[PDB]
Design a protein around this ligand. Structure first.
Ligand SMILES: Nc1ncnc2c1ncn2[C@@H]1O[C@H](COP(=O)(O)OP(=O)(O)O)[C@@H](O)[C@H]1O
Ligand code: BEF
Ligand SMILES: [Mg+2]
Lengths: 396, 182, 399, 54
């Protein structure tokens, strides 16, 4: 144990699910498999359910198991995992045919979880992985920790994970996710869309979405020099736009910031707190919008930095006209910083770090699965003894 | 963190081998002058004519520190005094290349007494000398200035047990020790 | 160990802590209060309330769940809170798992009436399978490897002093001070009032301010002086005169700076004014002329030990208690607090040697009550605690 | 091949249920759900490449 060919990482999210089977060994590659997170559920007279990849003869209903990051249908969710897992087996079993003795003989699974999943959901998933998929080794890695492990392993930090309809805020102290501080706001990328609809009434949804995803949309805090600029439709249609391309991100940025502030203010050990504020981690699709992260930082500074009020400072400098020492405050944060990205994953640098949580998982899985110690995953041994409850003896 | 460091080292080697071939194929020591002057900036700001850029923080005073008592003031330990103080303000080390008889003891006494006559920190600070002259250095720490205590180390382990057993909590201005006792 | 997983709930008078017995920290710490926003409607949770509070909307009002006894007094609201916890935080039917909850030490009287209201809530309403009730000072002490201990809990409602001898709680020596965290909030506010402009029904703003800047101020400005402050002052003065006179620094003149966000304004206190707030916990006769020095924490601790010596030698109980002093509670984390509680105890009992114990980890004392219940829930035998079942209720219901 | 048999041939043994349990000292009066071990007696495929990015 274990073959690197064999490591399987799954990262399921509301819209899609990133998947990878086998680690490259030279450098880590950005996940190439992206499967929409949904399954079809046919209902068979007599009550029971059947699950397919396609609307079978238009008889099945379309189930979207994960919504706003939460599992809303645990059965369709497990069926969706099986569907992924089986597909991978078939694919490899064709290509190579000796696969069941090699690449498919011992498949350890790392499943990236979301803060919102029940213990009940996590146990059921564990049961499913050991009983239905007949897999033997499982790590359930929280998304937040994947984040901090990718980010050159930070003991103290805050994860701001911007989704489409919600943003999660998750403080990590001493490599532990602080559950009672964790929260999400019902606000994300779509907010930008919505802000823009108000600013550009005569546009439609696809036009607005296209602007957001275009080279000329940025958050300010040379394109910025031009009054108007140009970009092209999804359907090739050229669209011109004024100052609106520097708008629409503000309401979201303010909401996130207000939340970050209330959160970090409830970290009880001020020495931990100082560290967290100095390692803000921002992740998610939205964050690839040029200027966004820096704009968000800018706002956290504007709202939360402990520093002398400018008027007060200006008086003191007039007074000294007749050198001014720095006023020291008892509060934190006096320093706010974004955590430093690792620049030595070439493939990741190339594609941006909106999905860096996955790199977290590539690193953890290699660590854990290419070393003897079985301290951080459930094994068959353990499953046989405690069952799904085995899960809680290997939490991080 | 350590894993990361190794991933980073490996990448750096990989990239370096790549660039090295790429740059030489299709498809004298004054680097120490300018580079070690910018490196002087590296010590000054980044660590904390060479007569100027290295000495950039300037000062001179021909008056002794007020703690020095019972001594005559000549010209040499002035220029040497604020010379080493010039090494102090810039956060720089140094070596004294002088002949002999110029009073290294004087420059250390007036050094600490002037510097931390200003800042008042005055400790903990370490001085180490040959056992051949030890109580001497304490004798110039006696008549040439009071108010800065001294921790010596001599003799059997018992006297030491008294000394670092009393000062075990680490309160003192200066420790005067010798070679093998570190 | 046992094949079970419990829900552990602690309803303090200020904070409510909830989570499962299988992990080291609680899933949630939320306020033991709620906003009633008006068709009525009930808001629970730290961010939900702070958001709603900042909206500054009329008709919004904060109400509490736990009285100063540390006991629930609004049981219709308590159910809504429990529902909220089970639905949105633990996310599990209350019918599945055993429940472990806390009560504060009492003199014994309110006990039966409470137990009944819990039956009604746990059984009639929620359909909980079975529950245990642990006594907070007792569990905290056990969680700390101690069977006998003098447990000094400084929370929001005041100080709660509880001697515990050989696993048993001495009820007549149970003592609850009236001055603690919430009191400190009031004083910080009244004192700073003129620098911040400011100088029930207005519960919403009182609450929001207590939960925001006032909370930060307490954690960063206040300190407890080691020795009676009036004496410290006379001394520091008497010394200061001599340094001055002698030639031709009084520590109380150090300044402390707090950035007050709502007005982007610096508030500076000298160290004395910082020491002053907690002095009230020790000498409450310094606010009103209506408080005796005996309502102060020092006399109170003493009172409770002496009432322990009356069991049912004294200079033995005294010796037991004083070698197992436990200091606990959110407010006990204010810098200087342990030492003053100790100095205050040591001088009322000079013949004895005090040894005190305290969780030094910031988080863990704020929730040490919940931590205590947690370590009860992980006890290896079902016989280690009284576990009330639907039965017990049935049988009490008879005549 | 048959997905179920693919699952069966890879990675080469108990089963648990989540059910009512009633502890004993004989038996305590109460129940609670837990993960109990069972006694002796107790669809499709998708094509990657569509989902591969290109
Ligand atoms: N201004 C002075 N007046 C009198 N004696 C001096 C003066 N400056 C130095 N000395 C003599 O120099 C000696 C100290 O020099 P020392 O510290 O041994 O120099 P180095 O360490 O460079 O050999 C003392 O014994 C002292 O008598
Ligand atoms: F002053 Be020299 F070191 F004899
Ligand atoms: Mg010499």
């Amino acid at each position: 144990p274990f073959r690197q060919d064999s490591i399987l990482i799954i990262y399921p999210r509301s819209q899609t699910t990133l998947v990878q089977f086998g680690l490259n060994e030279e450098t880590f590659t950005v996940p190439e498999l992206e499967i929409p997170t949904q399954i079809y559920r046919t209902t068979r007279q007599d009550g029971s359910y059947t699950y397919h990849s396609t609307n079978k003869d238009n008889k099945a209903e379309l189930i979207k198991p994960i919504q706003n990051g939460e599992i809303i249908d645990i059965s369709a969710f497990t069926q969706f995992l099986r569907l992924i897992f089986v597909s991978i087996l078939s694919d490899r079993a064709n290509k190579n045919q000796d696969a069941f003795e090699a690449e498919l003989s011992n498949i350890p699974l790392l499943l990236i979880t979301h803060h919102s999943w029940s213990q009940s959901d996590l146990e059921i998933i564990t049961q499913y992985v050991f009983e239905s998929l007949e897999i033997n080794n499982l790590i359930q890695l929280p998304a937040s920790l994947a984040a901090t492990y990718s980010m050159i392993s930070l003991q103290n930090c805050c994860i701001i994970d911007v989704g489409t309809h919600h943003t999660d805020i998750i403080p990590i102290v001493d490599y532990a996710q602080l559950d009672h501080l964790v929260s999400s706001i019902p606000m994300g990328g779509q907010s930008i869309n919505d802000s823009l609809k108000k600013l550009l009434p005569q546009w439609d949804d696809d036009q607005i979405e296209s602007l957001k995803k275009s080279p000329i949309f940025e958050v300010l805090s040379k394109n910025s020099d031009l009054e108007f600029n140009t970009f092209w439709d999804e359907k090739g249609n050229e669209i011109k736009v004024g100052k609106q391309r520097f708008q629409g991100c503000n309401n979201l940025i303010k909401n996130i910031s207000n939340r970050v502030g209330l959160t970090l203010d409830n970290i009880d050990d001020i020495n931990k707190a100082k560290a967290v504020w100095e390692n803000i981690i921002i992740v998610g699709g939205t964050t690839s919008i040029s200027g966004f992260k820096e704009a968000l930082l800018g706002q956290l500074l504007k709202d939360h930095l402990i520093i002398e009020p400018e008027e007060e400072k200006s008086k003191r400098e007039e007074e000294a006209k007749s050198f001014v020492p720095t006023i020291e405050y008892v509060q934190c944060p006096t320093v706010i910083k974004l955590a430093k990205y690792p620049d030595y994953f070439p493939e990741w640098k190339k594609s941006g770090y909106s999905e860096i949580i996955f790199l977290g998982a590539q690193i953890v899985s290699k660590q854990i699965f290419t070393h003897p110690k079985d301290t951080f995953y459930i094994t068959r041994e353990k499953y046989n003894m405690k069952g799904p409850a085995a899960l809680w003896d290997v939490q991080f | 963190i350590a894993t990361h460091t190794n991933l980073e080292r490996d990448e750096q080697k990989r990239a370096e081998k790549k660039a090295k071939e790429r740059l030489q194929a299709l498809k004298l020591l004054d680097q120490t002058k300018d580079t070690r002057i910018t490196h002087l900036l590296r010590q000054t700001n980044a660590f904390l004519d060479y007569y100027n850029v290295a000495h950039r923080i300037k000062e001179d005073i021909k008056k002794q520190p007020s703690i020095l008592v019972g001594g005559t003031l000549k010209d040499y330990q002035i220029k040497g005094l604020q010379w080493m103080v010039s090494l102090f303000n810039n956060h720089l080390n140094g070596i004294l290349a002088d002949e002999m008889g110029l009073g290294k003891t004087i420059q250390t006494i007036s050094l600490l007494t002037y510097l931390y006559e200003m800042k008042n920190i005055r400790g903990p600070y370490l001085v180490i000398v040959p056992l051949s002259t030890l109580s001497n250095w304490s004798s110039e720490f006696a008549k040439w200035a009071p108010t800065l205590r001294t921790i010596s180390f001599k003799g059997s382990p018992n006297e030491r047990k008294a000394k670092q057993a009393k000062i075990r909590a680490g309160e003192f201005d200066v420790v005067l020790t010798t070679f093998e006792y570190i | 160990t046992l094949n079970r997983k419990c829900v552990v709930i602690h309803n303090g008078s200020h904070r409510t802590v909830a989570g499962f017995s299988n992990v080291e920290l609680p899933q949630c710490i939320i306020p033991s209060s709620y906003i009633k926003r008006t068709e009525a409607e009930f808001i629970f949770g730290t961010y939900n309330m702070i958001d709603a509070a900042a909206e500054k909307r009329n008709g919004d009002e904060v109400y509490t769940l736990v009285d100063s006894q540390g006991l629930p007094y609004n049981w219709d609201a308590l159910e809504m809170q429990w529902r909220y916890l089970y639905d949105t935080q633990l996310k599990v039917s209350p019918e599945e798992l055993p429940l472990v909850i806390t009560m504060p030490a009492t003199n014994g009287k309110p006990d039966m009436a409470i137990l009944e209201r819990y039956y009604e809530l746990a059984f009639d309403k929620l359909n909980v399978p079975v529950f245990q009730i642990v006594i907070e000072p007792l569990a905290i002490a056990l969680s700390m490897g101690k069977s006998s201990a003098f447990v000094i809990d400084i929370g929001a409602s005041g100080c709660n002093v509880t001697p515990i001898i050989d696993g048993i709680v001495v009820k007549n020596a149970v003592v609850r001070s009236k001055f603690g965290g919430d009191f400190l909030d009031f004083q910080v506010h009244e004192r700073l009032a003129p620098l911040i402009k400011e100088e029930q029904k207005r519960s919403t703003d009182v609450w929001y301010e207590a939960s925001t800047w006032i909370q930060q101020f307490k954690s960063t400005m206040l300190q407890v002086s080691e020795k009676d402050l009036f004496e410290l002052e006379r001394y520091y003065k008497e010394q200061a005169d001599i340094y001055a006179k002698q030639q031709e620094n009084n520590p109380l003149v150090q300044k402390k700076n707090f950035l007050f966000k709502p007005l982007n304004k610096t508030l500076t206190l000298d160290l004395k004014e910082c020491y002053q707030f907690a002095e009230y916990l020790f000498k409450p006769q310094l606010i009103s002329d209506k408080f005796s020095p005996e309502d102060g924490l020092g006399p109170l601790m003493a009172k409770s030990v002496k009432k322990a010596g009356a069991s049912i030698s004294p200079e033995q109980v005294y010796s037991l208690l004083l070698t197992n002093v436990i200091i606990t509670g959110s407010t006990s984390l204010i810098e200087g607090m342990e030492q003053r509680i100790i100095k205050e105890l040591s001088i009322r009992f000079p013949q004895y040697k005090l040894t005190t114990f305290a969780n030094q980890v910031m988080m863990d004392r704020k929730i040490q009550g919940w931590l205590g219940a947690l370590t009860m829930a992980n006890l290896p035998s079902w016989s280690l605690g009284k576990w009330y079942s639907k039965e017990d209720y049935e049988t009490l219901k008879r005549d | 091949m048959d997905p179920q048999t693919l699952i069966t041939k890879a990675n080469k043994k108990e089963s648990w249920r989540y059910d009512w349990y009633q502890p004993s000292k004989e038996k305590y009066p109460f129940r609670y759900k837990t993960w109990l071990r069972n006694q002796e007696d107790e669809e499709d495929i998708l094509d990657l490449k569509e989902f591969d990015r290109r």
